[PDB]
Write a protein that binds this ligand. Structure first.
Ligand SMILES: C[C@@H]1C[C@H](C)C[C@H](C)[C@@H](O)CC(=O)O[C@H]([C@@H]2CCC[C@H]2C(=O)O)C/C=C/C=C(\C#N)[C@H](O)[C@@H](C)C1
Ligand SMILES: C[C@@H]1C[C@H](C)C[C@H](C)[C@@H](O)CC(=O)O[C@H]([C@@H]2CCC[C@H]2C(=O)O)C/C=C/C=C(\C#N)[C@H](O)[C@@H](C)C1
Ligand SMILES: [Zn+2]
Ligand SMILES: [Zn+2]
Lengths: 401, 401
């Protein structure tokens, strides 16, 4: 249940001292990451988020205006060009605001939801670095919603649904939500805060969620709610956040023309579901103990032969399965069949398709799983259909149950 | 045909002084980028490349080892943590080698093809920066092939085929190819260079490709092939390259077990087809004059209502086409039909569907293009099928073209 151990065993990634806290993603691990990306993008489509890409670094003046120079300075990597200082972005928010600021906005453009897979770098102390979980370089499932006050509640409700949606896909249904309210001194009026906090609380109660209050624990720039998922070992992972920000749009001069034809400053909401996607991959790796749901599995199927008499057939099948959109490898080496089955079982390949002479003759495949199950002889097209359903549904469970 | 002007007009991207030579990708431009990524990935699957992800920065010792400190010093951004100096990667190659070095390799693993969409930063002079074409931050369609000497030709052959495949998808059939051979002093033996040069030349000849020798223009580390496409204006763009490297693997201690069980150093091939993908997007933007082929179009279909009375209907179509994997938006605005048609025509939306009362009654859609071709009233499923065929084939031309 160490994601580093499992990571090494499955050849997912590795890290080096020449890049502390920075992941080298191998093919398989990167495949997992990319499937994560695909899922998130399906959610972005469904929930109507734009997807953008911000610049890797921006001028120091900008990060002064945002407040990062004051409150983020030690965490930021600085580099320079032509007598100008630049910070490598710890956060994607200012870039998103910069994109928002291009072109005149009106209320008709709101709510505006803007998402990115944001590459962030934070100069974390080397001694605090652990695996995929505490890192220097990472990617957030980051987004920002620009809306009217009147929209806030609805949008919050939208985020809440998204959270419980996404977590549910991974089999985390035990979730604790904490609402952090105003500190003694804050940006924004008492009224704005009453409205926002009430929006959060009501949004939660409409979803029937018994949230816990953290009183006075909100940031100076806004109130927030945070989502903590419990894994199979019942250990808590704080992942998702919905955070109101009154500081950012004002400092970056974001505005829109109201329905009353006057200048308004947009309400801004930071939202993330997974948080660091690397960290989330670690969490999943430990939750599943290396058995990834077939949709997330780097290699979904391994087709093997007894002798070379089946080699050809195997190859055929392989191409076929690859054409059907399945990640499939052929294992042709001369080794005993049990040998192959054991090796790929330890690699946590969801399905192993064995081809002997009878399979070739009958145009079938003998189906086995990493759980040690014999699924018996099966029609190839049937197998492809079932695998395609398992993947498309992102089912947590394999065949036969 | 200025890609910057069109870029602004289509809301693809923007750039600011606080991030010189670094792109803010808006939603539509990023949609284009991601589509390019999808294409490239289909290619990686077909031509059998791994896809990995390297760290964004590595310590200065590595970059000294590779030779970047000696030859690339002024072009590298540097930053520090805990009294250790790091370079933001100008190239993805060393990271790929670092990944290669994890686990024992034998001749059975060769050829090993490793690709990445590699985010690179180079500190170019500010005076040289132009649009998407000359930038500080870019992404290469980078790959490296680790092979034996005997494999070189074959692999080079694969690369050549890849190039001509990919270019032709975008409608570039006119390609000039240059072969650069040994300079007066170089890394690697006369025999190594004989063999590599012969491999390149014969590779080109067997594909029936006329080419020109640039003598002594090869890098000190290896001979190369370069690919220059010509656009519809007959302008030359150098994009693709296949580059032998005799330097990198020995400097980074890359090795594999040979058939003789003796330690061998693998041959390395840098290959890139598009080169900078930002630059390639500029190039395509100008080639198509902002009329992107349907598969590349950020918004493929806009569905408009004449009045409120069709709104519902429009929505329903919008979901349908959306579920069919089409990028579609609904224009429900309280504006005249001609207003909408004009805006979406200026946006170069390939297909404008109009729903009047007739259409709601008949279950059809009025179909017209950005070229101002009236395709008239068509059954929805027909339109869907046709659009899907146009997208899957990545067709250059629209319906009735
Ligand atoms: C410069 C300030 C730093 C702040 C004081 C650091 C605190 C530790 C904490 O408040 C950060 C926080 O919760 O950020 C959280 C983010 C959201 C996802 C997880 C967390 C994440 O990314 O880590 C949200 C805020 C981003 C905020 C801004 C921006 N830009 C603010 O306008 C700006 C005033 C923040
Ligand atoms: C540190 C050295 C820099 C080199 C001398 C700079 C020259 C201007 C030129 O030779 C670069 C070049 O052709 O790189 C090209 C790349 C390929 C695609 C476009 C070009 C690209 O990325 O621009 C290939 C070489 C990468 C090389 C290495 C690495 N690592 C070498 O082992 C190392 C010795 C290179
Ligand atoms: Zn943010
Ligand atoms: Zn390279």
């Amino acid at each position: 249940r160490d994601h580093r151990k499992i990571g090494k065993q499955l050849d997912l990634y590795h890290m080096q001292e020449e890049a502390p806290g920075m992941v080298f993603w191998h093919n398989d691990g990167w495949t997992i990451f990319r499937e994560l990306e695909v899922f998130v993008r399906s959610k972005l489509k469904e929930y109507q988020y734009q997807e953008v890409k911000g610049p890797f670094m921006m001028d120091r003046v900008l990060w002064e205006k945002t407040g990062h120079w004051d409150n983020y300075k030690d965490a930021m990597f600085t580099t320079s060009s032509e007598n100008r200082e630049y910070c490598i972005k710890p956060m994607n928010c200012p870039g998103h605001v910069q994109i928002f600021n291009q072109g005149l906005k009106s209320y008709r453009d709101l709510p505006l939801r803007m998402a990115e897979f944001g590459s962030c770098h934070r100069n974390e102390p080397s001694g605090s670095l652990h695996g995929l979980m505490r890192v220097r370089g990472f990617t957030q499932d980051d987004a920002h919603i620009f809306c009217t006050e009147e929209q806030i509640r609805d949008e919050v409700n939208g985020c809440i649904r998204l959270v419980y949606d996404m977590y549910s896909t991974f089999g985390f249904e035990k979730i604790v939500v904490k609402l952090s309210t105003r500190p003694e001194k804050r940006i924004g009026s008492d009224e704005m805060w009453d409205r926002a906090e009430a929006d959060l609380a009501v949004a939660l109660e409409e979803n029937n969620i018994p949230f816990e209050y953290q009183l006075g624990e909100g940031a100076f720039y806004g109130p927030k709610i945070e989502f903590t998922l419990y894994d199979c070992l019942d250990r808590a992972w704080q992942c998702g956040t919905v955070q109101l920000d009154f500081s950012l749009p004002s400092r970056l001069s974001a505005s829109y023309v109201g329905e009353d034809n006057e200048r308004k400053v947009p309400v801004m909401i930071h939202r993330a579901i997974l948080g660091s996607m690397e960290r989330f991959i670690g969490i999943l790796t430990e939750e599943f103990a290396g058995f990834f749901p077939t949709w997330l599995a780097p290699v979904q199927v391994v087709i093997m032969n007894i002798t070379d008499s089946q080699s050809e057939y195997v190859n055929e099948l392989t191409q076929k399965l690859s054409n059907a959109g399945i990640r499939v490898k052929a294992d042709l080496r001369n080794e005993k069949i049990g040998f192959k089955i054991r090796e790929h079982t330890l690699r946590r390949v969801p399905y192993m398709l064995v081809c002997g002479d009878k399979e070739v003759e009958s145009g079938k495949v003998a189906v086995r799983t990493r759980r040690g199950k014999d699924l018996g002889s099966m029609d190839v097209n049937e197998v492809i259909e079932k695998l395609q359903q398992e993947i498309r549904s992102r089912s947590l469970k394999q065949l036969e149950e």
